[PDB]
Amino acid sequence: TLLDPLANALSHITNSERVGKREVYIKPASKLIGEVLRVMQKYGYIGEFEFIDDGRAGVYRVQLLGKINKAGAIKPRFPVKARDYERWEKRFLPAFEFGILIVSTSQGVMSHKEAREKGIGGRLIAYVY
Amino acid sequence: PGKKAPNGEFAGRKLKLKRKKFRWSDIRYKRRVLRLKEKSDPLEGAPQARGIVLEKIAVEAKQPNSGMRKAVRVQLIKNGKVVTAFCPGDGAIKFIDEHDEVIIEGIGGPKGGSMGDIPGIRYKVVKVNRVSLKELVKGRKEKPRR
Amino acid sequence: GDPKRQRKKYETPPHPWIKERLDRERVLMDKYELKNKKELWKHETQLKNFRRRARRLLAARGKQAEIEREQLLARLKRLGLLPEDAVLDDVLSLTIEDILERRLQTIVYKKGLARTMRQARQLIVHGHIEVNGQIIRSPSYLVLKEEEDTITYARTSPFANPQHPERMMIEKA
Amino acid sequence: ARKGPKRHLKRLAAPTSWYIERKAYKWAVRPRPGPHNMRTSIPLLYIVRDYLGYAKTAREARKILNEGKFLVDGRVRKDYKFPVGIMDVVSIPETGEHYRVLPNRIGKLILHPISEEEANIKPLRIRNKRMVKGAKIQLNFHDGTNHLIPLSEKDNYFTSYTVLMKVPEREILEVLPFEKGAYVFVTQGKNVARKGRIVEIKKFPMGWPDVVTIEDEEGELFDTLKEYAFVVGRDKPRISLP
């Protein structure tokens, strides 16, 4: 059965970009998927996106631009401290400032660069580069 | 086969038990922890041992080699067990006599065992009546008491 | 547990017989007249340790990291291996030849107190060289920049006489 | 100790507040029981031999002590094992010098020079207080000593107050209360040897100790345990401190 809406969305996006699709539909929507999409848009990995209302949990329509090498969820959602980001960067990223780790903090969802500037930790939930 | 399991955040106990269970399939780990080598070693964990020669023999080399390898039967002082030991060198068997005492050590093959074209022999002679056998075979020294 | 054991200050090669490394090290040994491989290896290790400290300090941040960062630079310029306006990245361009040029044997030969490297080694070992008023008999001693120019013949040495036969032959070069 | 009290002390296991070379010898002086505790004092031999340098060996340090040349809180001390601790006064009259024993910024004991006049007074923090036979009050101080007061005075003394005492006569001359606006000097912990004024006091249930907030001169606020805060003045220090 379905266990993880966010993992399905990111695997779907990475499959679609590899064959040159220009847009995708993320079928079970949720607020967390929306926050992740906002962060992805801020750094230029996707274009415009919009919420579409069924009678169900909603749908997201997303525009792709061919700027994603890879994107995926992080399971389990490891806790991380405010001065410990480097080893996770070496685990998931290809060079010292290449890409973003997406972090859930008690101040919201944000990239690991913004959280490191604020001086806070949180829970890792995704990577994109 | 699906995804490797368990991956969950709160599944530490099962993951640890899985790793412990399949570690017993590694023969290196099992032999060390159960101390199997110690249970059957005639040298009792030592790097060298002393014994008394009971007779001289010769062992045929394995195919497709040909030749006779000279060895001795040795009774160890510490526990009385009898083992076969090789005598390295050209003409080395002539420096050995019955009732002489020797010092033996491992022959140096794979897995701490035998080597070359003589399986079945695990040891080699290093000293004879407390004189280095290598010297005797070369010269430079004489075997005492005739 | 176990009490402390004193450990070697140099590292050995991972494989004893590699042709290219053997050729390179033979050239260095001939040029600087070192006595054995371990001596050379000692200096190599010193260099490695410097680089390992720079690699760790580049990827660090905080308050103790800065103090360590400036201490590394200060020590390197005190030994004379970097100029006064160098930065941390310059640590990564140091070569083994930079360190060997700081040996007291090399510096005694460079200043013109001996005619050959071998003669400089014998002068050091026999006690004919003073460094800032002190006699030192170790040819591998690394000379600080602040004392480099106060390096002369010992005031009690036979060579501290411009009419000595062996000194005139040294001066003829 | 399999069967009895320990009487020896290895150098490597000596207290961390002493200035002592820990690898030069095998043994250190095991201090005698006395006024302070082990963490806040040091044997007198290390003051005579190691700190001041008036003697080179233990044998001639003992001859100096036996002739009566050193005074601690106004009294002659001859025992080379005698513990000398926080806020004591060390006096040498044949040379005319006086010191107060105080902890460092790193927690180590040092000697602070003082005037001859200030050497007559010792501040004592009130550690405990009790009723005693005849219905009188006994005050128990931080250095282990005791004093008696009549029942009519019971409202002028409470725990954590400081009393300035004239030594060696042991006569009270001033009581300094523990309250907001008082001047304090920290004696233990991470913020040791810092000083300032009291801002707030906090308490907790089930016997956890109480904590104080202190403002320093440059205007910074820091916390410490209440029992680590030693009152030394009203709004200015009454003793000389570094």
Place this chain on the structure above:
Amino acid sequence: ARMHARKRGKSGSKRPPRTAPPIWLEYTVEDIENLVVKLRKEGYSTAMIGTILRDQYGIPTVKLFRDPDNPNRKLTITRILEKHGLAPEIPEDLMFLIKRAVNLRKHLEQHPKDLHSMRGLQLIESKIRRLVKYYKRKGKLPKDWRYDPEQ
């Protein structure tokens, strides 16, 4: 997929997303409650009442009106029946499954060698026990309630 047979059938209803009742529907809430009560008194299941209301009276589901009592929720057939005291004592799906199991057990008393049908009884009783666990968790069944075929 199907709980036991692992098939992946997809047939079902496709409800459009809407908030209000359509303009062409003239019935009010009171008429709808009266119709629901009348049909229940005629002896129909809750699923059957909705089928009749859709097919014959042109009423797409009663879950298009707000509850006149509680504005926090919409109307359902079971809620309407509860408001009048005609709601089922046992949940209907459990009741239908139990009824299927009783008929099958007397068939098996006369056909002891019909093993393929016996596995069907085993699967049905697995479904019944799943449902009783859920309903006891929610409080719709008493804590002492037990399922016993000999009853």
Place this chain on the structure above:
Amino acid sequence: MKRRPRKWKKKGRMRWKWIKKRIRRLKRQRKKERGL
């Protein structure tokens, strides 16, 4: 017995079915003598 399908291959060995029969014949003799 446990399954070892590699033993059924014929290169350099006799047929496993008859090896199995021989093993079972040997095990019967041991069990009879264990009863006496």
Place this chain on the structure above:
Amino acid sequence: RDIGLRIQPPAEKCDDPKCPWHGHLKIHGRVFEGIVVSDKPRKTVTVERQYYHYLKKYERYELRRSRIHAHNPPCINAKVGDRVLIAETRPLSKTKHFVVVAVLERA
């Protein structure tokens, strides 16, 4: 009355000398919260508390449980299934070193 806990006293009184509210028993040390899982012995209960332990090599957690035997005063009379607060005390039997001081949520 207060015993340093900061919690309301029980409804009625008792005569147990081992009661911290109405007798001579003193409490000092740790205070734990838990669930009763047994009440068969006279004036004794078993209290269980759950916690997570971190496994460094596997960077994951496992669940562990701590079981403690505590004295049950008659004025409180805790039963199986409810949440209790317990406080450390001087040895009372071979296995009993705590006392129940309050029921937080009756089962």
Place this chain on the structure above:
Amino acid sequence: AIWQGRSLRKPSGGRIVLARKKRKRELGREPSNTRVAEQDKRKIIRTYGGNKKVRLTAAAYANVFDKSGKGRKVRIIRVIENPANRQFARRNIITKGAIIETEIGKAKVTSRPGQDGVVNAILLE
């Protein structure tokens, strides 16, 4: 002889293997079975740290107290009952909690005669 150190059993029921000899500071002593007699008899025990205990072995008198705070020294007739042990009353053994009969009536003992050396009782109405 009499050891008061630790149980040789775990609460699970498993056995414990001792890892050291018995220490002197862990030992007990024989109980004092304080009897009723015509004359008194007590002894003095040197205890840990060089302290003392007064152990009463035979008692002839008691100090009897009322609810008003007045005490009287009277002689003991016998032990009527003792809930500590089922046969102490037959043997006239006195402990804390025993019921004794005196010339002024029954009383309940409030002292520990094996530890304190005297018999103190409260008069029962």
Place this chain on the structure above:
RNA sequence: GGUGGGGUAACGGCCCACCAAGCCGAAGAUCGGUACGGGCCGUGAGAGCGGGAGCCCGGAGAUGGACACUGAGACACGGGUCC
């Protein structure tokens, strides 16, 4: 586990008298194997894997098994008793 005592420097099934049926266990009881614990030490890019004689802190023992006297402190390696 409870109630009433004894004993101890002191709390305690530490030991007794009386009343109950409790207590531990597949999240591994019980039993068996091996072993003094820690600070630390060897190795490896790290994650890890292996060891824990020598120095410091804690524990235990004085041919094996039992038991006492003196003393603030011992059931005492250069003190006492039995086998």
Place this chain on the structure above:
RNA sequence: GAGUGGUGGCCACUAUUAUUGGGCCUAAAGCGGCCGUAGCCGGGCCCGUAAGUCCCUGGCGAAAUCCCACGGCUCAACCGUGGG
């Protein structure tokens, strides 16, 4: 190179124990098939709590041992004073 060889042990080599990070059609390896208990893993929205989790600050985790700068033995090994 005043050392250099032999024998035995542990780590590495080894992603031949695999959390990071391995395999199971034909090479070692998916229970003959299925139902289900504990455990692990679990769909969307709103309100509350604050156990997990993150940040700040009090009290602790002896010394020796480890890293850095400076100083004392000719330099070093070693030893001291400060920072970690």
Place this chain on the structure above:
RNA sequence: GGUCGGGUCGAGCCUAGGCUCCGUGAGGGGGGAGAAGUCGUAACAAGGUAGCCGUAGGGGAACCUACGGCUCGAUCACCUCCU
């Protein structure tokens, strides 16, 4: 300090019962190397009766036969189903 009575604790010793371990041991049984003393030719090509799995019976020995199964089976003719 000797002698006697009573209570209680107790290493050791004796007898019997049950398990456990090391040392020899007549006789019996397969396993591994050696190199050939011997009888046959079962597997590899359609290996000259395709091979193999499960169960059962028979035979100097590899093996043979019966029922159900697999292709990890060659050749020719015909038929069926696809691209």
